[PDB]
Curated annotation (Swiss-Prot), chain A:
Subcellular location field: Nucleus
Subunit description: Component of the Mediator complex.
Functional summary from the UniProt entry: Component of the Mediator complex, a coactivator involved in the regulated transcription of nearly all RNA polymerase II-dependent genes. Mediator functions as a bridge to convey information from gene-specific regulatory proteins to the basal RNA polymerase II transcription machinery. Mediator is recruited to promoters by direct interactions with regulatory proteins and serves as a scaffold for the assembly of a functional preinitiation complex with RNA polymerase II and the general transcription factors.
Family from the record: Belongs to the Mediator complex subunit 14 family.
Protein's UniProt name: Mediator of RNA polymerase II transcription subunit 14
Lineage: Eukaryota, Fungi, Dikarya, Ascomycota, Taphrinomycotina
Signal peptide: none
Swiss-Prot record, chain B:
Organism of provenance: Schizosaccharomyces pombe (strain 972 / ATCC 24843) (Fission yeast)
GO BP field: positive regulation of transcription initiation by RNA polymerase II
Full-sequence range covered: 47 to 121 of 121
Compositionally biased residues, Basic and acidic residues: 56-66
Annotated GO CC locations: mediator complex; nucleus
UniProt name for this protein: Uncharacterized protein C24C9.04
Top-rank taxon: Eukaryota
UniProtKB/Swiss-Prot annotation, chain C:
Residues represented out of the complete protein: 302 to 339 of 376
Function of the protein: Component of the Mediator complex, a coactivator involved in the regulated transcription of nearly all RNA polymerase II-dependent genes. Mediator functions as a bridge to convey information from gene-specific regulatory proteins to the basal RNA polymerase II transcription machinery. Mediator is recruited to promoters by direct interactions with regulatory proteins and serves as a scaffold for the assembly of a functional preinitiation complex with RNA polymerase II and the general transcription factors.
Highest taxon of the lineage: Eukaryota
Protein name listed in UniProt: Mediator of RNA polymerase II transcription subunit 7
Assembly mode: Component of the Mediator complex.
Compartments it resides in: Nucleus
Family: Belongs to the Mediator complex subunit 7 family.
Organism: Schizosaccharomyces pombe (strain 972 / ATCC 24843)
Length: 66, 75, 38
């Protein structure tokens, strides 16, 4: 179309909101750390759409085309 | 601290519909200049605010629940 | 002689009724002793 692409990555994003509010229990401080990036380019949105198994190569593309 | 009630004391100082208010506000703005630096003393951000703090208190609210369980078994 | 009464009392202490679980009976009761509490 006169292209368009997704990237996907693992990522690390520590947050204070659990860092002190938790722990001192059966509650981990640092993991640390792991995630699942899902970039959605050529939109300027780069939206981080949710992932939740089961998931396939298709369904991503489906939500994205949607 | 000072940033709190300092606004409270500056707030009542406005007077007269006439543009003499600046003569008062010059006394205000300097404090505000100090506030611009007093704010530097308070350059911190741990918790956001509500409702996360409320989530913390509730988190203890569940976390304080066991205390009336196994401890009761101790008795 | 040391292990005896100590084991018995420690059973009788914080454990109190160590039989209170009654195996399967200690399942939902673990909520009844806790989740039920309010």
């Amino acid at each position: 179309q006169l292209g368009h692409y997704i990237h996907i990555f693992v990522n690390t994003q520590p947050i204070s909101a659990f860092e002190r509010t938790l722990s001192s229990k059966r509650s981990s401080c640092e993991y640390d750390h792991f995630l699942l990036l899902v970039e959605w380019h050529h939109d300027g949105i780069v939206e981080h759409v949710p992932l939740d198994d089961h998931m396939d190569a298709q369904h991503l593309l489906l939500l994205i085309t949607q | 601290t000072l940033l709190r009630q300092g606004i409270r004391q500056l707030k009542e100082k406005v007077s007269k519909m006439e543009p003499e208010e600046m003569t008062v506000k010059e006394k205000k703005s300097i404090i505000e200049i100090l506030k611009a630096r007093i704010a530097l003393k308070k350059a911190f951000l741990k918790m956001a605010l509500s409702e996360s703090n409320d989530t913390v208190v509730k988190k203890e609210d569940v976390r304080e629940s066991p205390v009336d369980t196994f401890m009761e078994n101790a008795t | 002689r040391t292990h005896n009464r100590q084991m018995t009392e420690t059973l009788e202490k914080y454990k109190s009724l160590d039989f209170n679980m009654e195996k399967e009976g200690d399942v939902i009761q673990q909520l009844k002793s806790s989740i039920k509490k309010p």
